[PDB]
């Protein structure tokens, strides 16, 4: 098809990351609003950007949730890596959660350059590595802005969601190093 | 992991690979250029301090050129990229040497061999310092001798 | 540190070293095998993205064959730095931030000899704004790989 030096033919291959589902999580995006992280063939996590909120109380009962060991430990591990990877997070009010009955659900209020919405969107940009630019509108520029007001993270069941981008573990594996690399004093 | 940042080549250079430091990157000096044969070692070795500085200077150059300047100097970018540019354990090595009264590298001055007629130079090694004063040439003479021999071996490897 | 995981050899191979990707590891493609001379570069270099993927695929293969658990996330969290170069994907993240063509780890390209059947190590097919680059935009990369193929074929 395309020959170089008359003897070397240019050939390609595309990896199907879906087969890594049993060992590592996989990030992907459905459309502009919805993005997903898949753990195995059953459980998962849905990162959705919406102008509509889902939690109105500004409390996060993590200690209660830990004691009542109902939630999936895997999903809790990736929801911790996300919140820790946020840089310069200083407005705990925007962080509101609801872990009643193991159902994990976390909401980040982006309405509250340098603001708390940048750091949460920077970490979201890394997390869903494929197809995150579609929701960002940012381009190249540090400072990230979006029309949407809330980033809602909910537990969900596995389906054929990865429509815009293929699944990949590259996003999650990168946040692991930059986990507690940027946090203020408590 | 280890550094993956590759040094960017300017548009007018004759051989793809060399790197140059402007007169504003060097104190009390004009611009200095280093050949591809020397800079190539920066991609192989993990222990060279002058290489870690080149990636810092290049990253700073690339970030200013390609990224619209922040309002008030956001530091988040370098906090992400540090391990992709420098060897953290290399500067920890110099911190160990300073603690043990050993001459260490404070990343300011470097020395190299320049052939008087061909113009090729070795990769700049760090000029060590002990108690607020750089070492005399007399105290690392045998480090310079070894570098000349490697220069000879590298020059003969072309012919 | 750096990655220490060595790729495991299958039993029906002619030379100890090569690695093969099954038809279920590749999308819309049959199985592809790569020779010892190419995969040997995975142990030397630190900068190759396709090597990082082979170590991930191999680790997933070895972990399924030898253990039983899907909270297996605890295992990869320990092993990540022994399989991949963390800063290599940070490099791609930096390139994406600077409007530079980056590698999203999906498509790769390689040169395949017409009669020898020998192949280069697959390099990553870069992408910029949701579309892979044309062959025309990295043709001098392919030219350089073809030159390395000839000098390797002579040895």
């Amino acid at each position, epitope marked *: 098809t395309s020959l170089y030096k008359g003897v070397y033919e240019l050939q390609t291959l595309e990896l199907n990351m879906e087969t890594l589902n049993m060992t590592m999580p996989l990030s992907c995006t459905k459309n502009n609003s919805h993005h997903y992280i898949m753990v195995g063939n059953e459980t998962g996590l849905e990162l959705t950007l919406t102008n509509t909120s889902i939690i109105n109380h500004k409390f996060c009962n993590l200690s209660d949730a830990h004691k009542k060991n109902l939630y999936d430990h895997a999903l809790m591990s990736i929801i911790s890596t996300f919140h820790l990877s946020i840089p310069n997070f200083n407005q705990y009010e925007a962080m509101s959660c609801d872990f009643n009955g193991g159902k994990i659900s976390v909401q980040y209020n982006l309405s509250h350059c340098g603001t708390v919405a940048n750091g949460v969107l920077q970490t979201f940009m890394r997390m869903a590595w494929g197809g995150s630019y579609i929701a960002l509108d940012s381009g190249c520029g540090d400072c990230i802005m979006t029309s949407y007001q809330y980033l809602i993270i909910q537990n969900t069941t596995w389906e054929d969601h990865c429509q815009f981008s293929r699944p990949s573990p590259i996003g999650y594996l990168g946040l692991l190093s930059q986990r507690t690399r940027d946090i203020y004093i408590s | 992991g280890t550094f993956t940042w590759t040094l960017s080549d300017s*548009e007018g250079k004759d051989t793809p690979g060399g790197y140059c430091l402007t007169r504003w990157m060097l104190i009390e000096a004009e611009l200095k250029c280093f050949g591809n044969t020397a800079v190539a070692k920066c991609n192989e070795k993990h222990d060279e301090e002058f290489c870690d500085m080149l990636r810092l200077f290049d990253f700073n150059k690339q970030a200013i*050129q390609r990224l619209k300047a922040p309002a008030q100097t956001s530091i988040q970018l370098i906090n992400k990229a540090v391990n992709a540019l420098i060897n953290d354990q290399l500067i920890m090595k110099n911190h160990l040497r300073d603690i043990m009264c050993i001459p260490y590298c404070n990343y300011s001055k470097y020395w190299y061999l320049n052939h008087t007629t061909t113009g090729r130079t070795s990769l700049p090694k760090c000029w060590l310092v002990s108690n607020g004063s750089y070492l005399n040439e007399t105290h690392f003479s045998d480090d310079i001798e070894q570098q000349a021999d490697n220069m000879i071996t590298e020059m003969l490897q072309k012919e | 540190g750096t990655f220490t995981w060595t790729l495991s050899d299958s039993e029906g191979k002619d030379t100890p070293g090569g690695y093969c990707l099954t038809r279920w590891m590749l999308i819309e493609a049959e199985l592809k095998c790569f020779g010892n001379t190419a995969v040997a570069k995975c142990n030397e270099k630190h900068d190759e993205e396709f090597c990082d993927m082979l170590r991930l695929f191999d680790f997933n293969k070895q972990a399924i064959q030898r253990l039983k658990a899907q909270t297996s996330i605890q295992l990869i969290n320990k092993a990540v730095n022994a399989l991949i170069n963390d800063q290599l994907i940070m490099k791609n993240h930096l390139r994406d931030i600077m409007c530079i063509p980056y590698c999203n780890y999906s498509k790769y390209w390689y040169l395949n000899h017409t009669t020898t059947g020998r192949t280069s190590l697959p390099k990553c097919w870069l992408v*910029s704004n949701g579309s892979y680059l044309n062959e*025309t935009h990295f*043709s001098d990369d392919i*030219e350089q790989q073809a030159d390395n193929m000839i000098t390797e074929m002579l040895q």
Partner: antibody
Amino acid sequence: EVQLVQSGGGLVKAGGSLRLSCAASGFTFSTYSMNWIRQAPGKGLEWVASISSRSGSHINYVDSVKGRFTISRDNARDLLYLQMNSLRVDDSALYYCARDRRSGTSPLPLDVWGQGTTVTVFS
Amino acid sequence: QSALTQPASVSGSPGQSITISCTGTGSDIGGYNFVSWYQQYPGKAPKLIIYEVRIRASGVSNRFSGSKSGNTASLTISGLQAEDEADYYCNSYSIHSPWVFGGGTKLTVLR
């Protein structure tokens, strides 16, 4: 100073043929891809042809030039050629040769240009 | 196959700031960040001033600045000087060809 020295313009009858030369000076010519750009009298620049580094395995032309012009390179003598055949009147312009690098990791723009050589096709 | 839309001419008093447009489609300027700008004096070869949208070439004054928004790239010149009066061309990577040039712009430093 990195430069390119062109040669071989002149006058040619419509339908004739011409050969354009471009000689590299002071740079490892073999590692760069070479381009041809023409500029009509009192008009803008227009890219014409391209050839990849080392073996010229990757070659591109403009649709209004396909099957009539042929780009080539001799890495031994550090030369770039452009063989024009069945020359139209429109082809008459000032022709430049320029070097670049089609790389994903370290690309280069059209940094080095030739001095330019004139081609005039009369009917 | 078509060219890139540039203004025929832009003019400005000395010391003033002026901008040169360069409009294309998603196939060229919108699809790559490889826009370059060239300065051509009469009877001379084009001189590369800016490449990769924003980066200046060696020796190019900081008065020259390159930008891009969507399908349009812009070359801005502050502190207009007589030496700047020349023809300015833009070019970009393309899905269909390695390069595609603009029509060109005659910058005039009004006297």
